[PDB]
Design a protein around this ligand. Structure first.
Ligand SMILES: OC[C@H]1O[C@@H](O[C@H]2[C@H](O)[C@@H](O)[C@@H](O)O[C@@H]2CO)[C@H](O)[C@@H](O)[C@H]1O
Ligand SMILES: *S(=O)(=O)c1ccc(CCN)cc1
Ligand SMILES: [Cl-]
Length: 138
């Protein structure tokens, strides 16, 4: 049926090539459902496999989440959250990460799941993707 929402969006502002002075958000990810559910995961697909942005120059940059924990074993971020309230997460690069003046891509799949004793079952899912084009700095 449908109360399950997911938005995933590249960052609006300018991002400039070079060593980032601080943590810089690449992607905004917002997720909620007022239906009962036990939590969320984000699974990076294709060349993003492993939690990476891939650039047009062939470089892989690792991404980081504020709200979710990474598990390499499973190729996902996840958060157990039973709330009807929206999760506003950001995926970001860390202070000091060197970016180039190029276009960076991410693709993944978002899953919503429920626990049954006590093992998770996917109840909703949506494929997400986006890109940032980084400008010459700096
Ligand atoms: O709680 C459900 C999530 O579990 C994650 O799996 C691991 C994880 O490393 C950690 O929470 C630990 O307690 O063991 C779990 C073994 O299943 C999944 O990676 C995630 O997708 C959720 O299912
Ligand atoms: S890889 O090992 O540098 C790499 C990059 C990014 C992630 C996700 C952030 N936890 C994992 C591994
Ligand atoms: Cl992370």
């Amino acid at each position: 049926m449908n109360t399950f929402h997911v938005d995933f969006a590249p960052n609006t502002g300018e991002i400039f090539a070079g060593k980032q002075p601080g943590d810089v958000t690449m992607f905004t990810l917002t997720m909620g459902d007022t239906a009962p559910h036990g939590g969320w995961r984000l699974i990076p697909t294709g060349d993003s496999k492993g939690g990476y942005m891939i650039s047009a120059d062939g470089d892989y940059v690792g991404l980081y989440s504020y709200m979710m924990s990474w598990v390499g074993i499973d190729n996902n971020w996840y958060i157990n959250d039973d709330s009807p309230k929206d999760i506003k997460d950001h995926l970001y690069v860390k202070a000091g990460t060197v970016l180039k003046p190029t276009t960076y891509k991410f693709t993944g799949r978002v899953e919503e799941y429920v626990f049954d004793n006590k093992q998770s079952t996917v109840i909703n899912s949506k494929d997400v993707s986006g890109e940032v084009t980084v400008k010459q700095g700096l």
